[PDB]
Amino acid sequence: GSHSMRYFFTSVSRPGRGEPRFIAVGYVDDTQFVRFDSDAASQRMEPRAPWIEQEGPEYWDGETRKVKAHSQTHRVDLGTLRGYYNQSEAGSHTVQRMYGCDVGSDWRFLRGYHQYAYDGKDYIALKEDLRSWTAADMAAQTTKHKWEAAHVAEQLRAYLEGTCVEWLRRYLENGKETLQRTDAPKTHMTHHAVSDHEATLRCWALSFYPAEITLTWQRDGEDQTQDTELVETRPAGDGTFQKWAAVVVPSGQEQRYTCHVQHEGLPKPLTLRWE
């Protein structure tokens, strides 16, 4: 199916406590393969997947240079943004950056992303046409003008439509065994009394890859939001994912309900009924 490569960077200011924390991670789809942490020993970009280990020192030296620069840039940024908003050097602030590309099933380019957040909210984002900017406010407008004058969009387009995609293809090949795998969910249901007239039915999806999945509850074969609970998809710690969906029901009515499961490891959607 379709695939993606994304890099995430977090920079956090530590007033009265020295340099800002800087963490970077790179993902192919839902698999992380690289990391950089300002708080760790190496001060280098480190591999977090088997299929990236084969890259030579040229790769590691260069990516280490690159990410350190990202770090420097964000360090200046934090100072700049505090001024933009006339904030004090008492509070800690956060800068977040995310960029990457999507490729369709043909591994051809599909979409490009470059987004920037200050203190947990949109600041400036590159639009889908990769030629224009969305600025959250007038402070971000200043930044927009800077990046239009310096023609940053055009620089990003080259990367997102070229380098980003070409290297994603390379990881997909070298990591074929894992990245091109599809683990279908193992499913089961649980039942718990809530009072003596209500009971909870919980629909479980385990050991699946990738993480994209849909769990819906139907009642008499009709979709049911209402008394339903959907937890955030979670990592098992072994490359697979987990998720459950629950519904509270009147005792004696359990058989009215069915959980439906959609996942690309499943040729046909699963329908589950209690027992």
């Binding site: 990516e63 620069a69 990003l156 990367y159 980003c164």
Partner: peptide, 9 residues
């Protein structure tokens, strides 16, 4: 492979 476009805000 990461990007080397680093424009400051």
């Amino acid at each position: 492979l990461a990007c080397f476009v680093l424009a400051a805000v």
